[PDB]
Design a protein around this ligand. Structure first.
Ligand SMILES: Cc1ncc(C[n+]2csc(CCOP(=O)(O)OP(=O)(O)O)c2C)c(N)n1
Ligand SMILES: Cc1ncc(C[n+]2csc(CCOP(=O)(O)OP(=O)(O)O)c2C)c(N)n1
Ligand SMILES: [Ca+2]
Ligand SMILES: [Ca+2]
Ligand SMILES: [Mg+2]
Ligand SMILES: [Mg+2]
Lengths: 822, 92, 824, 94
């Protein structure tokens, strides 16, 4: 072998360390895997790298950069400038931290361990939430926040599971012990949100630090955190919808090793990282990798080398770091923030540590992991180990070690003392000009814009509707959103193909036929006729093909900005069961559990049209089952004007409560399902609606002996059958607001039909679905003088939302109408 | 006189009119500085004759005077004293 | 020296990033997509060979920058990188004329089928494969390569696009069945199918099947894996087999926007190498038409490729030009070879286009004018491939005419057939004998020689032998008695879930770990062997799952579909986390039989009960499962005794009916000393859908003294019974409904008739008034049994927006209030 | 008079008598030997009998006609020969 052959192997060796050195790094503080770890004469031979270096010197730089307490994964990144940035900061001789910095890390380890000792000594059942063996996450998190403050950023928003939460609250968020342990019994405090101010120890800046609320459902909060941060960024005019590119609100997402690899919402949330409608300018992820998930070993938890491998999905750099090295942990945390600031992309920190105690109380973890726990039993605490390492290296004197010990005792006294002291003692109507302005906006096209020939009639029809009436559902929605933007409200609308609309009805964004340029007619309403801004905005997006992460994000966004109108639209309501964890754990229940309020709107296209069991139902029955007084508003409007007033009421009521709307599909193009101008200018939301022959016509309510109560599009088919047979003995009353039940309005309406001898709840849905399961039980109870004897007319009970046959659908639909008028 | 310029209690004033004025996390301190970055016994403000002196009494994070670490220092009007994350200005 | 360093770095640059420059897009939408000249004739040493720079560049550009983009240097295993490198960095032999004509025959059938579908029926545009027809010769090449390895079956999962095309041209189903009474569209877009594939050029046949699926994109991914795993365990191949062939292959199809956005994709990839879930590698095909309805890829994903999630498990990724059917078939064969060599997932990203709009009347130029102006210039895949063969002189004009006649005949074959088509519960004993109980008890102490039991586990083993011979059988042992007796009778039992080997509440110990070596011992596996040494045919497959609910529940549903004779149980850590698998519950478990005729016997074990641990550690949402139920879809139960749970599982496993079972299981009731069963309950009884208090059935209690009846289910029974005993309340009786669905109407009526002096009836439950069994029972009981349940009142927690309060003190106050009201 | 037995294909075991001058084999539903598969062209092959001699002729199929795994335009058949038409394998017997 010649110098030419020797060179080729040296360049291949340099590449091998850059690509795979992380597989040999000393990252495990337990050293469980023993098997984990050119000739000798070539060591003093020089090689071109435009430097010249001896092979021993090349090896020394490579082993220090890639094979000590930090394992770097970055050659998978497709952007070469990002690879070079990491390479330059990792392949250099590092300046040892100053004694003041080392003592500061020790002070944080003192506070972390003193807090855990307090928690495990004072209370029962705290073992499951213990941070013992992972305490280095406290100086790590502190280094993340300090680095964000160093960049002069505005806020760090944290999301995390239970492990170390109270520790984080005290030692990171800075909440007093008297508030954390107030009436402490695990506790609800493990789930609550918090805010505080972080002050740099060595720098000139302060930064807000907050923590979002979350359920026990590991990782479900990940997309909620992203939406909350985006909402705050939009308010601060930073990031994607901001005049600056600082993304000055930082998501800091904490995870566990087994949950990060197994929960699909992790991948869904990473997939939002660079999207125009969802990007937050990069998240800082910290995985508390204690190499166990309750009793489960990593080999049964994941199919890859690392728990963090999913982050390779978006080309994020990954830093595997030894939790027994708090200096390497703090350094990795600062580098992660710097990378996030430089490239506005996610960084993942895999902190390798251990779980000192059993997962629960009384649990002896040597039952299922005897080898791991025999090794853990030999481990000294992170604080004692770091104190001893500082003495050994001569970084601190024995007098300073004694100072550190007295500091630790004082940290212990401080928390016991404080807890000891605590235990002792409006119209939604708009004027004609407003309707006309929104209509005219659809034709106020930019100079030289080419409308698609199939889109142009929609624009012209909207101006026609705004001035002359017969307003359809899709325009009534834009009238609601547009009038809110003109009144200074931020409106955020998103979902799958939501810009155009699944049923080609919305056209919130129109595309130039020759250039592809976009035009948003409702954005013109963000400017008053005189040219001044209203303060309003239209943020409309096509989401990713997600339900869990997308619904989570919109819930999060509404929490981050309570003054925003936030709407998420399902392609068909049948796909919202993909976001069941957000509905159950956040939307329907967050106010009662955490005092956390949300005004998020869910739009669920619903209706029996013979398109099958996945294109028929938004499961009204599930949302009604989840409901309890004051938790959500649930509606199925039958008219475009009533939908318009429902959205405007929701946006202007000053109440933060989720709204669930079962929206139409074929009823979008039903010519009978149109509204008059008067319905927008001189009316309000109608929780209960009567037939126009009684309110506007000459119909006689006294002739009615059979009352049909219903909701949604089946109203029009019932009304048509009544008109066909000239059935004056039958009346159809619509319940527009399904929850809260409009008890008073419903009673006052039914009293206007004195000769009614029988009442029926009519619905398209199977008997075990729709509004019947809750209404059949609740109506005779809350209105016994009106609804005792109430009977049901519906499709038979089914294990699916509908039949899979359109012919069977049509036969069943006719059977309901025939029974209603039989 | 000492005024807190940085810390959760920013704007709080403390009179130095005794031979020894303790500053630390101990709840019995003359200047109670409640933060994890402040040791139970951190510093003392000593008055001898006409001069005021700051003394570090074995804290973990040290005591700084005008952004420099000190064991003991004679204080002069306008000096900034750092005790943990707290920043105090000494005034005459 | 500086030149060699550049050449070696250039070789690495093509291997790592050549795929970014490859000609993979048939539309060429992105125009911007695409050492000196004297160095081209200089020789350099390469891995040991000597080659000119121009020759190195030529091999690299042919391997990495033509119609195939290879992604493999991310793979951590160097032998896997070398294997790909050797097959990709070689001069390839052009396909023979017979092979090219075979690909053309498959393109003929694909396009003829699409023409038929778009011409005969309305509303077929949304499911069109036009612009992606090359997926048919690609899939055919995958299956043919699997048959070449002598494998047993390929099982396909896919969404709607091209499904009927796949049914006809891949599965081999006749047109008279595919188009029978033809109308998400027709139900046939969702149904399962089986067929036999015969190699055109080789000696083998291979079974080809297609699993059923809902419209929920990607939800079927973990169902496919479970089904494949169950079939592999049956054929004694794979993880739980005597051979390592994994002779049943998952073929998973996807769309570009769904593959990147649906979390179940990552959850399913995460199972790929797990001992309890691995299927020896899935072949993935992404039909990447660079659009998702009206959405552009930039709003769909945060990465260069839709396939980047597969990097999670170090899978090789092949981006291939859909306008090159030879490159597509070659990539398909290489993917099968890699899967066979390393038993790992391979992803094929097939770049193509969507010729038509995603819906009828929908002009896609409204939202994508530029893409559709380019698509309008594109010639069909078949015409393009036919013309290319003529141009290159691979086929004569006479053979092109042969191919055209063949195409016309493929068209006539489908039109003619459709025109002609248009013209035209076992209830045997679940009781076991004493010897059976004793054998399962003794198995817990029949430890391997030298096995060191953990000191806290040893009393559990000894208590089980004690219970087997003497009684007071607890819940955890009764479960293992059920599973053990089924294994002894020759049944395969698969049990899994989070920490299911030991049990969340440290109660199961299905697997015990040697204190000194970490070696595992499974006491119930000893029941797979008869006393005489012969096998029973039974097996115990028990695993700790990944921290997933969606993929894990999907897999277990899939497994039961794949092996209907298996006992398949999935256990939730707490029933409160099963809402993570809501799409499987709604789209498969509760509804698959009525929608597709697809049967499943999967068991869901949901730990449930109000104990003051908060809203995420209290409820398996009984009310949601009762709301989903309709006659014959599922069995829903909340047993109160260990023997009744034992009989419920044995009835479920022995009835010869494939129907899911939902069990609301206990937590603190596991250690309730009153919640124990006698030996006679296992040996002389059966499952009891309705249970009375033992003082009336076995004691001297007088039913005629009862004026107030308390109807309930689950653990609250014991608190009600203890309050009755404390106050000697002879005027009150407690009846348990053990089987919540189907409602045991006749047994409940016969039981209530035994209390003639009852003046009032109450449904008592722990759950909030809008949860538990009250919303369905409050409505159904007065209607199905009006002479018994008219006037039925509710005693429960108040209605709540969450399953419980977050305070244990509030819980305790509410629990006492229910008991006080029940006996007030 | 001769016989064709299907050895591979969905109709394996099926027998066809060759006792007329021309016997058509293809996907056309009117074929004398209807071979229903996408790999078989509408008009694929013909079995032509003349003076006790049986001949297989490819009549312009896409996937060709094989006799003893060798592609042919036309071939004189002999007892035991394997004929391949698409995925179908037939044995010719006397
Ligand atoms: C979505 C979800 N599924 C299941 C659980 C039950 N659970 C609680 S802790 C745990 C293991 C967590 O492992 P890991 O993510 O490594 O975190 P660690 O406890 O080790 O910090 C599980 C399965 C949960 N809380 N959330
Ligand atoms: C889980 C789920 N969410 C939403 C939909 C609605 N949907 C039907 S087609 C479509 C887009 C599919 O895009 P892609 O995956 O690229 O497949 P393509 O139609 O392009 O083949 C969507 C959102 C669905 N069927 N499933
Ligand atoms: Ca509101
Ligand atoms: Ca069964
Ligand atoms: Mg863990
Ligand atoms: Mg697509």
């Amino acid at each position: 072998d010649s110098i030419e052959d020797k060179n080729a192997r040296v360049i291949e060796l340099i590449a091998a360390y850059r690509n795979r050195g992380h597989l040999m790094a000393d990252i495990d503080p337990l050293r469980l895997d023993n098997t984990r770890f050119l000739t000798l004469w070539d060591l003093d031979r020089e090689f071109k790298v435009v430097q010249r270096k001896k092979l021993r010197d090349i090896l020394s730089v490579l082993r220090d950069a890639y094979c000590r307490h930090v394992g770097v994964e970055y050659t998978h990144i497709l952007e070469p400038e990002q690879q070079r940035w990491i390479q330059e900061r990792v392949e250099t001789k590092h300046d040892k931290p100053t004694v003041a910095e080392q003592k500061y890390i020790l002070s944080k380890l003192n506070a972390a361990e003193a807090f855990e000792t307090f928690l495990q000594t004072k209370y029962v059942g705290q073992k499951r939430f213990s941070l013992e063996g992972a305490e280095t996450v406290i100086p790590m998190m502190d280094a993340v926040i300090d680095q964000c403050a160093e960049h002069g950023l505005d806020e760090v928003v944290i999301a995390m599971p239970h492990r170390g939460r109270l520790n984080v609250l005290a030692n990171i968020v800075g909440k007093p012990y008297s508030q954390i342990f107030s009436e402490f019994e695990g506790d609800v405090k493990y789930h609550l949100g918090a805010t505080g101010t972080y002050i740099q120890m060595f720098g000139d800046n302060d930064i807000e630090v907050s923590l979002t609320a979350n359920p026990s459902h590991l990782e479900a909060v990940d997309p909620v955190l992203e939406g909350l941060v985006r909402a705050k960024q939009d308010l601060l005019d930073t990031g994607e919808e901001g005049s600056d590119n600082r993304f000055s609100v930082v998501p800091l997402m904490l995870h566990g090793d087994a949950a990060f690899a197994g929960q699909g919402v992790v991948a869904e949330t990473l997939n939002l990282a660079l999207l125009r409608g969802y990007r937050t300018g990069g998240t800082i992820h910290i995985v508390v990798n204690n190499q166990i998930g309750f009793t489960t070993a990593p080999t049964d938890s994941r199919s890859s080398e690392y728990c963090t491998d999913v982050a390779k999905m978006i080309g994020a750099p990954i830093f595997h770091v030894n939790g027994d090295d708090p200096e390497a942990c703090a350094w990795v945390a600062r580098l992660a923030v710097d990378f996030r600031q430089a490239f506005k992309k996610d960084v993942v920190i895999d902190m390798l540590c251990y779980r000192r105690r059993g997962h629960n109380e009384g649990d002896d973890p040597s039952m299922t992991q005897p080898y791991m726990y025999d090794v853990i039993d030999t481990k000294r605490g992170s604080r004692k180990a770091y104190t001893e390492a500082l003495i050994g290296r001569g970084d601190i004197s024995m007098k300073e070690a004694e100072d550190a010990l007295r500091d630790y005792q004082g940290q212990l006294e401080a928390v016991f003392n404080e807890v000891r002291e605590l235990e002792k003692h409006l119209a939604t109507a708009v004027d004609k000009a407003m309707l006309q302005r929104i209509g005219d906006a659809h034709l106020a096209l930019p100079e030289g814009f080419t409308v698609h020939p199939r889109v142009r009639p929609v624009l012209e029809k909207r101006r026609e509707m705004a001035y002359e009436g017969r307003i359809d559902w899709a325009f009534a929605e834009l009238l609601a959103l547009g009038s809110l933007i003109a009144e200074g409200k931020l409106v955020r609308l998103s979902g799958q193909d939501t810009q155009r609309g699944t049923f080609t009805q919305r056209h919130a964004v129109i595309v130039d036929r020759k250039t592809g340029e976009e035009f948003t007619p409702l954005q013109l309403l963000a400017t008053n006729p005189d040219g001044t801004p209203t303060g309003g905005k239209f943020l409309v997006y096509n989401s990713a093909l997600s339900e869990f992460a997308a619904v989570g994000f919109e819930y999060g966004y509404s929490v981050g900005n309570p003054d925003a109108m936030v709407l998420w639209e399902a392609q068909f309501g049948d796909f919202v069961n993909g976001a069941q964890s957000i509905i159950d754990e956040f939307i329907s229940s967050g106010e009662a559990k955490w005092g956390q309020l949300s005004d998020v709107v869910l739009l669920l296209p619903h209706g029996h049209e013979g398109q099958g069991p996945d294109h028929t139902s938004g499961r009204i029955e599930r949302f009604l089952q989840l409901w309890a007084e004051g938790s959500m508003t649930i509606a199925m409007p039958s008219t475009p004007a009533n939908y318009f007033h429902l959205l405007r009421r929701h946006g202007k009521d000053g109440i933060q409560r989720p709204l669930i709307v079962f929206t139409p599909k074929s009823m979008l193009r039903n010519k009978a399902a149109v509204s008059d101008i008067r319905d927008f200018t001189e009316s309000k939301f109608r929780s209960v609606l009567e037939e126009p022959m009684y309110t506007d016509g000459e119909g006689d309510r006294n002739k009615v002996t059979r009352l049909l109560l219903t909701s949604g599009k089946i109203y029009y088919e019932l009304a048509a059958r009544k008109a066909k047979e000239n059935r004056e003995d039958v009346a159809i009353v619509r319940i527009e607001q399904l929850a809260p039940l409009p008890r008073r309005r419903l009673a006052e309406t039914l009293d206007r039909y004195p000769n009614v001898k029988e009442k029926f709840w009519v619905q398209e849905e199977p008997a075990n679905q729709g509004a019947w399961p809750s209404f059949g039980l609740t109506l005779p109870e809350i209105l016994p003088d009106h609804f005792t004897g109430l009977k049901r007319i519906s499709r038979r009970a089914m294990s699916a939302p509908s039949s899979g046959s359109s012919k069977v659908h049509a036969v069943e639909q006719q059977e309901i109408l025939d029974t209603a008028f039989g | 006189l000492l005024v807190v310029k940085r810390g959760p209690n920013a704007g709080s004033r403390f009179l130095l009119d005794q031979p020894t004025t303790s500053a630390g996390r101990h709840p019995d301190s003359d200047i109670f500085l409640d933060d994890v970055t402040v040791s139970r016994r951190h510093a003392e403000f000593r008055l001898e004759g006409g001069e005021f002196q700051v003394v570090d009494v074995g804290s973990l994070n040290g005591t700084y005077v005008n952004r420099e670490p000190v064991d003991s220092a004679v204080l002069a009007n306008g000096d900034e004293v750092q005790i943990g994350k707290f920043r105090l200005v000494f005034l005459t």
